Design a protein around this ligand. Structure first.
Ligand SMILES: *[C@@H]1O[C@H](CO)[C@@H](O[C@H]2O[C@H](CO)[C@@H](O[C@@H]3O[C@H](CO)[C@@H](O)[C@H](O)[C@@H]3O)[C@H](O)[C@H]2NC(C)=O)[C@H](O)[C@H]1NC(C)=O
Ligand SMILES: *[C@@H]1O[C@H](CO)[C@@H](O[C@H]2O[C@H](CO)[C@@H](O[C@H]3O[C@H](CO)[C@@H](O)[C@H](O)[C@@H]3O)[C@H](O)[C@H]2NC(C)=O)[C@H](O)[C@H]1NC(C)=O
Ligand SMILES: *[C@H]1O[C@H](CO)[C@@H](O[C@@H]2O[C@H](CO)[C@@H](O[C@@H]3O[C@H](CO)[C@@H](O)[C@H](O)[C@@H]3O)[C@H](O)[C@H]2NC(C)=O)[C@H](O)[C@H]1NC(C)=O
Ligand SMILES: *[C@@H]1O[C@H](CO[C@@H]2O[C@@H](C)[C@@H](O)[C@@H](O)[C@@H]2O)[C@@H](O[C@@H]2O[C@H](CO)[C@@H](O)[C@H](O)[C@H]2NC(C)=O)[C@H](O)[C@H]1NC(C)=O
Ligand SMILES: *[C@@H]1O[C@H](CO[C@@H]2O[C@@H](C)[C@@H](O)[C@@H](O)[C@@H]2O)[C@@H](O[C@@H]2O[C@H](CO)[C@@H](O)[C@H](O)[C@H]2NC(C)=O)[C@H](O)[C@H]1NC(C)=O
Ligand SMILES: *[C@H]1O[C@H](CO[C@@H]2O[C@@H](C)[C@@H](O)[C@@H](O)[C@@H]2O)[C@@H](O[C@@H]2O[C@H](CO)[C@@H](O)[C@H](O)[C@H]2NC(C)=O)[C@H](O)[C@H]1NC(C)=O
Ligand SMILES: *[C@@H]1O[C@H](CO)[C@@H](O[C@@H]2O[C@H](CO)[C@@H](O)[C@H](O)[C@H]2NC(C)=O)[C@H](O)[C@H]1NC(C)=O
Ligand SMILES: *[C@@H]1O[C@H](CO)[C@@H](O[C@@H]2O[C@H](CO)[C@@H](O)[C@H](O)[C@H]2NC(C)=O)[C@H](O)[C@H]1NC(C)=O
Ligand SMILES: *[C@H]1O[C@H](CO)[C@@H](O[C@@H]2O[C@H](CO)[C@@H](O)[C@H](O)[C@H]2NC(C)=O)[C@H](O)[C@H]1NC(C)=O
Ligand SMILES: *[C@H]1O[C@H](CO)[C@@H](O[C@@H]2O[C@H](CO)[C@@H](O)[C@H](O)[C@H]2NC(C)=O)[C@H](O)[C@H]1NC(C)=O
Ligand SMILES: *[C@H]1O[C@H](CO)[C@@H](O[C@H]2O[C@H](CO)[C@@H](O)[C@H](O)[C@H]2NC(C)=O)[C@H](O)[C@H]1NC(C)=O
Ligand SMILES: *[C@@H]1O[C@H](CO)[C@@H](O)[C@H](O)[C@H]1NC(C)=O
Ligand SMILES: *[C@@H]1O[C@H](CO)[C@@H](O)[C@H](O)[C@H]1NC(C)=O
Ligand SMILES: *[C@@H]1O[C@H](CO)[C@@H](O)[C@H](O)[C@H]1NC(C)=O
Lengths: 728, 726
């Protein structure tokens, strides 16, 4: 008896992981939305109270997609008519509800199709973007103040990023930053005038007679990049001057010498802001620390306060320069950077001193700085057990770096080895989120002694259900190649028997700084394959992978499509040597970068793989965006790295595909890795007469995440894999 | 016992059908192009001479893909730098070789990127279109006369057709008609200003960093159509210091009242031109007959002299109203029209008489009028043996309609039941072109006594090769669908045994006035499927088929996606019970309209078909072009036919696809049946949770005819079919 974890179970989300989403409104309380009623909790005792009743907005005439209470808790921003755009961006309508009088504001309302809205960090001021222009509202019911007039569709962006800045630089749509108390409003401006447009059809609903053409300013490798400008305006002078001037903070000269980017902006104090810039050739980065000059009204950035951060073996940062964490007085800060041993650690900076002081160990890395107090600095790292795929919360004593404590390592070592954290406004409390290898466990803690106040969610319900199913196991481990260890993970079928030979599916990504082997617990396609189809699903983090030091991460610098690819092939060999793998049924599949690698492997001539599936794959780097691509590949010019750009394409290996069963899949509306990329792969396979399978997904983007589409692609892929392994 | 006809044989064109493409230059001679040269032949005796050896341009610096000899014989138009556009259209570079001096003309040459060129009908005058404007050269080496100045890319077309006129009306890129003696240059003008544009991406060569977007004025059902104007310019009058004057021929008022089309242009004499207009609602057309007036310089089209052709059961014409054949004095004419019973026959008209006189009749139809002499009217029909799928040349005595003679029926009955013809200028000689059921046979004859002069090409070489391969056979027969009989054909495997059970594949098209069951000999995919895979490939012509009368053809009027799909299923149903047909293994595939019908059948819930393949199918008529779609469906408005437009989509049948194995294929650069159509089919199947097989072909259009793609798609489809059949 006891059934297995079926494809339907996966697709219908029968076994759901319960979460405990919380939102800190103060240093002592947080909000917890219950799909109907949003109540506020007292961290100290856990007692609750309804903050906004379930029916408070019925008869609104619109479904509320999200709420956003202002800092002073006097107003709430109701978000509706949501319409996704790219990964983070989206458009929608907004209404402000006065809580002080249980009244909805019906005057000077925020425009329909607003692109972005943000409360000031204090009070209830509003700053929003509409038609690529920035507007500011001092009072919710009063007329807005326009800040920019240069806004222009697909050409000029004020307060919001263009496409590449959203996805690759800021991993965020917003391009404006309120100062801590809300006096100043800093924002960036992007000019995509000279940037080539990506164009693709969008079919929409059946009812559309003529397909629509989507055109998005998008710089492909080597193409013209958007240009950027930074401004700071004083919102306290809006109601006094009629057209408040936006002060521009330019340079650095070392940056203005050529193409560059604005990669980070964080306020240190009420009158101090830091700006990090990056050269197009991303091996050089510069941080400026500018102070408001009350006399000149301008913003000066002393060169003595300018910090250079470069890299000789690769690019700066994992995906971009590290973010700074200033001490309360804004005179010093903490930033993760790779030490002399190529390992990423926290080092302490003084704004006017160029040499920083490292405060963390060695053979492991700090993942991120989570909180800073007058006493300790809280951060997450993978030091525990020397497991690069594990994650824990530590705290180091600011006065004595030799004093480091792990607040999560021992809470429940068997069930929890991967943690994320969420502190209260002042770090008085913090929620710990354990995500594996056991079922997600959420707990609340007071920072005084790190005492565990209580368990917010332990997924006991789920646990009961899963004991009624032949669930698969997960093995996380390492192999040693060229005297260096490389981690991998396998999702073993129930009742694993090392004596039997199993068909293995190599789940891959292998992009720079990626990590596919961890302690995270997951209920996904692989879960079904192992549980029901008795298939071993493995992942391997080879050269180029991250969180293990630059020696490994920078291994593929300027050489994408090589080691990373070879290591996945070697991994299959290594897994075969373990004796429980069927040499005749080894498959491989990936998505995005995983698709690129899968494809490169499939067309490698290394007869290891029988079949493979590539989803939304990159086929040639000259087709992908500039920021991401050039970071690892440099420029596609003959004086730079053009040769390797051309030698690392998937099309150039078309002939080799005659010896493997291939399945190419791609959404036609993919704005990230354009359908074009697969379009050229199919065409190349056609030119050399190689048969293969294909599937396009109309109007789906890079995520192919529509409910029906999601279920269709996995259902389709299962058939392919089953057939390739002669199952069931 | 010998090899079979394999997929490679087909894809590689191992067994190639020989042809005899001649071009009549007079009433007595013709040109015969070859690989290394061009010869002139004497029809009377068969003797010939070398006109030029091509080696005349061994050092032209360009690869010529076509030659065009002035009717004069004095000049050769050399077409190179070919660049295909749509079905008939394309651009190209041109050079003119003066045969009198045997030298290339160096001055005033034709502009590169010329969209169209045509010699006048008699001398050596040239009319060409460049950048949407018309130009005329009176002498090959002389400066051109700018006829029009309004041309504008994608907006105004002078002398060439827009996408929809090229494809659905004139079946040609040309929109200019020289008068018989080359005095007048008639031409149409198209305004697409308000016509919506279909847009799609073209990826090009791997080296292209950014995909380019193709946009082309294309009216989908109910959209804003391009408007048209007609003009006539006297080429003997054009000055050089003055802009050429173009007289316009407008109306009819019964046409200007609403949307309409110019569907036919036919000169009657040196000074009389006829024009046929069709209302957007294609069940009413009017023919104007206009004569030039020297004193006023205008062209007058006397009312009363116009003829109305309308239909009450459907649309007018098979695809459009037929072309008129005017007598020598242009005072009368013959033209095919639908008689009272719905059959198409030849009707005799007097330019100023309202009713005409049918000179043919019966339950069969005249396919087309091929030649007219004071003595006879030569035409092709399917009267012989009552086989709608057969074609023979006949001649009817203009003095006594009782005397009709079949000129080809008996030449070789066993080998030939399908002919086409090519008469000399004045119909003194004619070339018969047999295309089935046996190997193609080309013969030359003389009209005086209908003597079989000589055999031009008998495909004897090919016949010797095929005798060494196990070729399949073809059975043409019919079934009775309550009262009426409907024809079908089956490509049968070698050594067919009615005792053995074979898998059947229903090859379908079934569009209005289509014919898939005929006596033509074909070397195609089905040949391989039957020859090598022993698969019976059938085809059926049900309600909607052509060449059998309006009762059959107009049955699907305003009702596409109904009777023709149901009948396709009825047929399959009866084939399955035949005994030598494995009812558990019946497939179905088609292209374009066939794709649509295949998809409609597969989503009908018949349970008759196991699997099916749809290539570049139409999914919903609102996505197809206006001229074709509207002709049968009317307008997609609630006052008209919107309801049926909505009830006849493929997506509406998604849920039914769960019971079958479907393969969807479509070229991404399809300008005809937009990739959009299959994108909407896949999306609807996904939304209903139906798994299917798919395959796109980047940068391939409606023909998916690039050499590699052609091979790939058939290779892909073959695997799919045998997989389904095993
Ligand atoms: C609030 O102040 C803004 C800062 O100057 C002002 O910016 C714009 O000012 C003018 C007006 O649109 C723009 O146009 C200029 O026109 C001259 C004359 O043709 C050109 O020589 C010049 O190159 C430019 O085109 C400016 O481009 C623009 N300046 C900036 C920095 O944005 C706002 O218009 C103003 N708002 C209001 C309502 O007055
Ligand atoms: C091709 O066909 C066009 C109409 O489809 C001709 O044009 C005419 O039609 C437009 C409206 O569609 C009229 O108005 C235009 O101008 C006004 C003001 O600039 C705009 O508000 C409006 O939207 C249109 O853009 C024009 O008045 C009318 N043209 C003329 C000259 O009156 C066009 O002329 C025709 N070309 C040829 C060579 O036939
Ligand atoms: C962002 O970048 C674009 C350039 O990519 C800026 O456009 C450029 O603006 C200048 C204004 O100094 C234009 O110059 C002007 O040209 C006209 C002739 O067209 C001339 O008469 C004027 O004297 C002046 O020289 C320039 O043409 C234009 N270039 C392009 C490519 O459009 C744009 O202004 C910038 N936008 C913002 C808000 O920063
Ligand atoms: C949560 O409940 C407290 C009540 O605290 C009580 O006293 C503690 C010692 C402990 O025994 C708790 O379990 C008891 O419930 C509320 O605190 C009140 O807050 C208001 C201001 O909002 C303050 O003026 C009162 O003095 C507080 N009451 C007490 C007894 O000190 C708190 O507001 C509750 N919050 C929610 C969200 O329900
Ligand atoms: C084709 O042949 C004729 C001549 O053929 C001969 O004469 C016939 C009348 C008949 O008796 C045949 O058996 C003979 O073989 C050519 O006629 C000549 O044409 C040229 C002009 O082209 C003219 O100068 C001559 O006077 C004609 N002579 C005759 C006999 O009429 C004809 O030109 C040949 N055509 C080709 C394409 O070679
Ligand atoms: C049609 O073009 C050809 C080729 O010209 C080249 O391609 C064109 C598309 C355009 O980009 C030109 O600038 C290119 O030079 C013309 O033929 C000549 O070709 C020779 C080289 O073979 C070149 O030196 C000449 O400049 C070209 N043009 C002339 C008139 O000399 C051709 O002439 C063009 N059509 C006509 C009739 O002018
Ligand atoms: C013939 O007509 C054309 C178009 O009307 C004339 O060419 C235009 O002349 C005007 C006035 O000089 C220019 O602004 C245009 O640029 C010209 N070209 C076009 C396409 O409009 C031409 O001059 C006329 N020729 C004569 C002698 O009447
Ligand atoms: C030509 O087609 C038109 C439009 O389809 C026919 O007119 C319509 O006929 C129907 C009767 O079935 C009426 O309900 C409509 O009101 C008529 N008007 C229109 C334009 O919709 C017309 O009868 C046809 N002509 C012929 C000769 O059959
Ligand atoms: C927070 O904003 C500024 C940050 O410096 C605070 O200081 C005032 O800043 C303005 C600049 O526009 C100066 O002109 C004033 O003189 C500053 N005030 C003082 C104390 O000198 C400001 O006080 C803060 N505002 C709020 C609302 O907290
Ligand atoms: C071809 O046709 C044109 C027009 O029909 C002929 O031109 C006419 O010739 C007569 C002389 O018999 C004149 O009276 C007319 O004025 C001409 N009409 C026009 C508009 O040109 C032309 O001569 C014919 N070509 C030949 C050589 O027969
Ligand atoms: C970061 O990498 C770039 C690679 O372009 C280096 O750029 C230049 O300097 C190299 C050696 O100093 C040369 O080998 C490169 O050719 C040159 N770049 C170009 C386009 O010619 C840069 O020095 C590196 N930065 C550091 C400090 O290592
Ligand atoms: C937003 O759009 C709706 C519907 O068109 C309209 O009723 C409403 O007034 C609009 N609100 C604003 C802020 O324009
Ligand atoms: C040794 O090199 C790398 C490690 O440096 C290892 O992954 C690889 O498999 C070995 N051989 C080669 C040439 O890749
Ligand atoms: C007659 O045949 C047609 C098509 O062959 C079919 O649709 C119909 O049901 C049959 N009987 C009647 C009464 O129409």
């Amino acid at each position: 008896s006891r059934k297995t974890y079926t494809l339907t179970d996966y697709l219908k989300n029968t076994y759901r992981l319960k979460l405990y989403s919380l939102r800190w409104i103060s240093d002592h309380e947080y909000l917890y939305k219950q799909e109907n009623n949003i109540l506020v909790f007292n961290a100290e005792y856990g007692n609750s109270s309804v903050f906004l009743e379930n029916s408070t907005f019925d008869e609104f005439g619109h479904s509320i997609n999200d709420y956003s209470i202002s800092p002073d808790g006097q107003f709430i921003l109701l978000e509706y008519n949501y319409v996704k755009q790219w990964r983070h961006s989206y458009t929608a309508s907004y209404d402000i509800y006065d809580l002080n009088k249980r009244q909805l504001i019906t005057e000077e309302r925020i425009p329909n199709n607003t692109q972005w809205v943000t409360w000031s960090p204090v009070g209830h001021k509003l700053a929003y973007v509409w038609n690529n222009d920035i507007y500011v509202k001092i009072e919710p019911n009063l007329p807005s103040y326009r800040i920019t007039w240069t806004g222009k569709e697909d050409i000029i962006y004020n307060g919001i990023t263009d496409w590449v800045y959203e996805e690759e630089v800021f991993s965020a749509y917003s391009a404006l930053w309120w100062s801590p108390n809300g006096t100043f409003l800093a924002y960036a401006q992007f000019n995509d005038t000279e940037v080539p447009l990506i164009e693709y059809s969008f079919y929409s609903d059946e009812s559309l007679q003529y397909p629509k053409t989507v055109r998005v300013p998008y710089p492909k490798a080597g193409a013209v990049n958007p240009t950027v400008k930074f401004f700071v305006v004083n919102t306290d002078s809006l109601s006094s001057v009629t057209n408040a001037t936006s002060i521009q903070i330019t340079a650095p000269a070392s940056m203005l010498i050529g193409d560059h980017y604005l990669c980070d902006v964080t306020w240190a104090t009420q009158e101090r802001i830091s700006l990090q810039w990056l050269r197009r050739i991303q091996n050089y980065s510069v941080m400026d620390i500018c102070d408001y000059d009350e006399s000149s009204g301008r913003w000066n950035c002393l060169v003595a306060r300018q910090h250079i951060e470069m890299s000789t073996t690769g690019w700066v940062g994992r995906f971009r320069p590290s973010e700074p964490h200033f001490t309360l007085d804004g005179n010093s800060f903490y930033k993760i950077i790779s030490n002399e041993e190529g390992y990423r650690h926290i080092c302490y900076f003084q704004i006017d001193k160029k040499d920083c002081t490292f405060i963390t160990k060695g053979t492991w890395e700090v993942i991120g700085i989570e909180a800073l107090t007058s006493d300790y600095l809280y951060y997450i790292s993978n030091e525990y057990k020397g497991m690069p795929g594990g994650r824990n919360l530590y705290k180091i004593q600011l006065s004595d770096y030799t004093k480091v404590t792990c607040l999560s390592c021992e809470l429940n070592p068997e069930r929890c080895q991967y943690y994320s954290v969420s502190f209260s406004k002042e770090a008085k409390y913090y929620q710990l989120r354990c995500s594996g290898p056991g079922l997600p466990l959420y707990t609340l803690h007071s920072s005084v002694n790190d005492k565990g106040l209580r368990v917010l969610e332990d997924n006991s319900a789920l646990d009961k259900m899963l004991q009624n199913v032949q669930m698969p196991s997960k093995k996380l481990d390492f192999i040693i190649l060229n005297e260096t260890k490389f981690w991998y993970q396998m999702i073993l079928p129930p009742h694993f028997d090392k004596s039997k030979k199993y068909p293995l599916l190599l789940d891959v990504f292998a992009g720079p700084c990626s990590q596919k082997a961890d302690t995270v617990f997951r209920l996904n396609w692989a879960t079904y394959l192992a549980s029901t189809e008795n298939i071993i699903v493995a992942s391997f983090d080879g050269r180029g992978s991250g969180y293990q030091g630059d020696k490994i991460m920078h291994a593929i610098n300027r050489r994408l499509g090589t080691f990373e690819v070879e290591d996945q092939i070697e991994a299959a060999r290594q897994f075969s040597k373990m004796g429980f793998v069927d040499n005749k049924r080894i498959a491989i599949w990936g998505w995005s970068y995983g698709g690129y690698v899968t494809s490169m492997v499939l067309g490698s001539g290394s007869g290891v793989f029988k079949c493979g599936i590539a989803v939304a794959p990159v086929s040639r780097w000259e087709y992908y965006d500039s920021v991401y691509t050039e970071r690892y590949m440099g420029l596609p010019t003959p004086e730079d790295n053009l040769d390797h750009y051309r030698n690392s394409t998937v099309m150039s290996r078309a002939e080799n595909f005659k010896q493997v069963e291939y399945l190419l899949i791609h959404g036609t509306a993919d704005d990230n890795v354009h359908f074009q990329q697969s379009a050229q792969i199919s065409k190349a396979l056609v030119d050399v007469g190689v048969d293969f399978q294909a599937m396009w997904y109309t109007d789906e983007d890079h995520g192919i995440a529509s409910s029906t589409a999601h279920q269709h692609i996995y259902t389709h892929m299962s058939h392919f894999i089953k057939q390739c392994f002669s199952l069931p």
